[PDB]
Amino acid sequence: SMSLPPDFKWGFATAAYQIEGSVNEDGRGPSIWDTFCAIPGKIADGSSGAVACDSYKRTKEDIALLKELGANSYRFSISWSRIIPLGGRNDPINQKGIDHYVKFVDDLIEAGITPFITLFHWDLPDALDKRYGGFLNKEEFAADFENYARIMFKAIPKCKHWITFNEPWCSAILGYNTGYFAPGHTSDRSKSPVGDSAREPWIVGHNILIAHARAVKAYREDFKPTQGGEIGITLNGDATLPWDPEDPADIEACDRKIEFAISWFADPIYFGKYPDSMRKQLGDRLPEFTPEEVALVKGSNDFYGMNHYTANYIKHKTGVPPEDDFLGNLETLFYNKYGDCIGPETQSFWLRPHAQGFRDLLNWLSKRYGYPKIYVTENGTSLKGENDMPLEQVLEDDFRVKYFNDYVRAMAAAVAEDGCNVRGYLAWSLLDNFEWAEGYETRFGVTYVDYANDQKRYPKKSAKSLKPLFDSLIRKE
Ligand SMILES: OC[C@H]1O[C@@H](O)[C@H](O)[C@@H](O)[C@@H]1O
């Protein structure tokens, strides 16, 4: 029923912009998020990644925290603009930036912690966006990304777990359909002077796939022979249930939703084509790969990186969807035809807990993609009103304890009962941190960070719950 293999990797996850602070220190150049946060109205509490958890200066304390919690693994990202402040292949490299991360990894390894390193977690160097529209220029972006990646592969050979992109769905849809995330492109001219919500998202997804696959080929050809290790992309995606369990169109739409959200990226990576359902709806707004691109992209995951948070009921729509539609001509809802609920609210409008969906989606993905090795690179939750609670109540985060309990056991059943090859689980997040367009109000941390008192760390009940939870699941031999 529930049991995990002895080598199982587990720990916590973070991202550079969300935690590091020191946004102008040691040569770092601006990212598209530094710029986006300077624009009134884009961040709900008017804040930015300035200061954040001050983790750039507190690596030693953060490592000691990981060790105190029992983690054997830690996922973090590299700020590209600390490595190449302007980002490009002909721009000057910042050795201080490199040395910071090389040392960090030496120190993690010395503490007995396996590093999982994300190259790109949304913080595109601003200059690349300004020069050529960043992801919108296929050849320029792929060349600059591959160059950046090779610098990191060469400098950090002790890392054996590399992630290219985090959640390209976010970068494409939220960055170029709705403008909710940097760089804020949308057709809506009351929010952005540039963008085309019907066309730019699909170009952005396409070109990220190309860049990913170049970085993977570089890793496999020039580094893996002598350094070993593995590389893949991390995709997010939520589970689906039919709004009307008797309606075959809703049942079909549960698959279609997942195809538009995840298979957009995974079908190219495993099969060398986009989902037929996407081709049908988007037609020539969805780019086509050339034969050379198909060969490059197909087979470009050593493992499947999975981020997962929630589930939705799916209600099919009829007729022709608007050109700005990205869901696949359907509606997502938290209540079904019979008034059944996904789960209670959290601080995030889009997140309700549903552990069964995690198990369901693990199965769906494993079946569609031939049982790849899966690392769960993010899973966790916010808690409604957490930012307003007194300390004693914040630390007693029973709701979050429960989220991890149910989601981790659901995953363990996916493994031991359903045969899914999950080999790691990284809790989002080690620390309360900057939650993008929501600012600091939305807390995902297993560790409370007191921003008013020098970002002092207090482990919550959840933080201490994970080690005994995994002790109950991971086989000794
Ligand atoms: O309507 C788009 C919404 O979709 C959700 O799944 C995203 O995570 C939100 O961050 C976003 O604003």
Side-chain angles (χ1 to χ4, degrees):
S1 186
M2 311 188 312
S3 154
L4 298 173
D7 71 357
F8 193 85
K9 304 284 186 186
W10 78 269
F12 305 89
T14 61
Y17 194 73
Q18 304 181 256
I19 67 166
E20 283 186 350
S22 293
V23 299
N24 300 314
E25 309 305 311
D26 291 353
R28 179 178 180 279
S31 85
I32 61 173
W33 272 93
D34 299 77
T35 303
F36 194 66
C37 299
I39 304 167
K42 303 301 177 178
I43 311 307
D45 61 356
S47 68
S48 79
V51 195
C53 310
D54 200 31
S55 289
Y56 184 84
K57 303 316 178 98
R58 298 173 68 173
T59 49
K60 110 113 74 200
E61 192 191 356
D62 290 348
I63 297 177
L65 176 59
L66 287 161
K67 222 178 178 211
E68 172 194 336
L69 294 181
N72 70 40
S73 298
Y74 179 56
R75 173 176 181 243
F76 61 102
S77 82
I78 307 293
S79 177
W80 184 343
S81 75
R82 288 193 191 285
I83 305 308
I84 312 176
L86 303 177
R89 61 202 182 280
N90 306 319
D91 295 313
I93 298 159
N94 185 37
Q95 198 60 48
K96 289 183 291 315
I98 294 163
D99 293 338
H100 172 82
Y101 292 111
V102 174
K103 178 178 194 308
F104 184 59
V105 168
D106 284 345
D107 294 338
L108 277 168
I109 286 166
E110 167 73 46
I113 309 299
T114 303
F116 276 75
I117 296 179
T118 309
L119 290 168
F120 184 91
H121 202 134
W122 306 352
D123 47 1
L124 184 78
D126 192 65
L128 304 187
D129 192 49
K130 299 300 175 38
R131 290 177 187 168
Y132 55 75
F135 312 119
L136 295 168
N137 190 305
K138 176 166 67 171
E139 295 301 334
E140 288 302 335
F141 182 64
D144 286 341
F145 186 69
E146 184 186 336
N147 173 74
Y148 165 49
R150 286 173 174 281
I151 285 154
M152 302 314 300
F153 298 159
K154 185 189 164 58
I156 316 187
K158 295 182 191 177
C159 173
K160 313 305 183 187
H161 298 84
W162 285 97
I163 293 156
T164 52
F165 291 83
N166 186 77
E167 300 190 5
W169 182 98
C170 287
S171 292
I173 298 303
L174 302 180
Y176 297 85
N177 190 295
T178 69
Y180 182 66
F181 277 7
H185 291 205
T186 164
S187 290
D188 187 345
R189 286 282 161 275
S190 66
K191 299 170 132 73
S192 172
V194 305
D196 182 346
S197 297
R199 289 178 188 80
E200 290 192 348
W202 318 112
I203 295 166
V204 167
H206 192 76
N207 291 171
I208 286 167
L209 285 166
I210 303 305
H212 155 81
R214 301 262 195 87
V216 169
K217 171 206 269 281
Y219 188 80
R220 281 169 181 176
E221 289 183 1
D222 295 338
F223 299 89
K224 187 192 286 201
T226 59
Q227 303 177 187
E230 288 195 302
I231 189 161
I233 203 167
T234 274
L235 297 184
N236 62 327
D238 298 318
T240 60
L241 297 174
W243 180 82
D244 179 350
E246 305 307 340
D247 183 347
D250 284 354
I251 288 161
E252 181 174 340
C254 288
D255 284 324
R256 187 168 65 260
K257 195 271 161 173
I258 299 169
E259 295 177 336
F260 275 68
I262 312 189
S263 300
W264 178 6
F265 305 104
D267 283 15
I269 284 169
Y270 289 94
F271 301 114
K273 56 197 297 294
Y274 289 117
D276 288 348
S277 62
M278 293 185 73
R279 182 52 62 201
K280 163 165 285 178
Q281 180 181 316
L282 300 172
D284 291 326
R285 293 184 290 118
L286 187 61
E288 302 189 358
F289 297 100
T290 63
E292 300 194 326
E293 287 171 343
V294 172
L296 184 71
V297 174
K298 183 173 127 81
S300 59
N301 261 353
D302 292 341
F303 58 84
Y304 185 109
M306 172 182 195
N307 298 354
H308 178 77
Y309 288 93
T310 195
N312 305 271
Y313 293 110
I314 305 307
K315 189 185 199 300
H316 81 288
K317 294 183 140 191
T318 50
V320 182
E323 53 174 3
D324 288 359
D325 179 65
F326 56 86
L327 283 164
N329 205 21
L330 52 86
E331 172 167 20
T332 51
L333 305 157
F334 289 127
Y335 296 90
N336 79 353
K337 183 173 187 188
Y338 299 101
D340 209 352
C341 82
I342 292 301
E345 288 184 32
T346 61
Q347 189 57 36
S348 311
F349 68 89
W350 54 272
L351 203 176
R352 312 250 190 158
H354 193 265
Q356 179 67 44
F358 185 28
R359 187 173 177 184
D360 293 344
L361 189 60
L362 278 165
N363 279 290
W364 191 98
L365 293 167
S366 294
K367 293 171 179 157
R368 189 176 183 104
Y369 301 116
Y371 293 89
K373 185 165 73 181
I374 296 165
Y375 292 115
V376 178
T377 44
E378 301 183 8
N379 179 238
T381 190
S382 54
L383 200 159
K384 188 167 179 152
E386 194 173 10
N387 200 51
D388 311 312
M389 295 176 180
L391 186 67
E392 298 212 327
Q393 190 181 348
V394 170
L395 303 195
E396 272 285 302
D397 62 336
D398 286 308
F399 176 85
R400 181 171 294 108
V401 173
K402 181 175 157 63
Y403 186 95
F404 285 122
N405 190 77
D406 301 346
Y407 273 71
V408 173
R409 297 182 186 287
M411 169 195 80
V415 175
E417 196 56 51
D418 312 339
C420 301
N421 192 20
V422 183
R423 293 282 176 168
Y425 177 94
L426 300 153
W428 187 266
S429 181
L430 184 67
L431 309 172
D432 288 340
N433 64 51
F434 177 79
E435 178 62 11
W436 306 114
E438 288 179 1
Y440 291 100
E441 285 177 352
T442 302
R443 292 179 186 258
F444 274 96
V446 301
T447 307
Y448 178 70
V449 177
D450 191 342
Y451 304 120
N453 180 19
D454 295 337
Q455 304 83 42
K456 181 188 175 46
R457 277 82 157 126
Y458 301 73
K460 310 171 185 176
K461 193 181 184 183
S462 57
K464 295 162 169 169
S465 79
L466 287 172
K467 156 95 183 161
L469 174 59
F470 283 104
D471 284 349
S472 88
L473 289 169
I474 293 170
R475 298 188 299 275
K476 298 260 187 284
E477 296 183 353

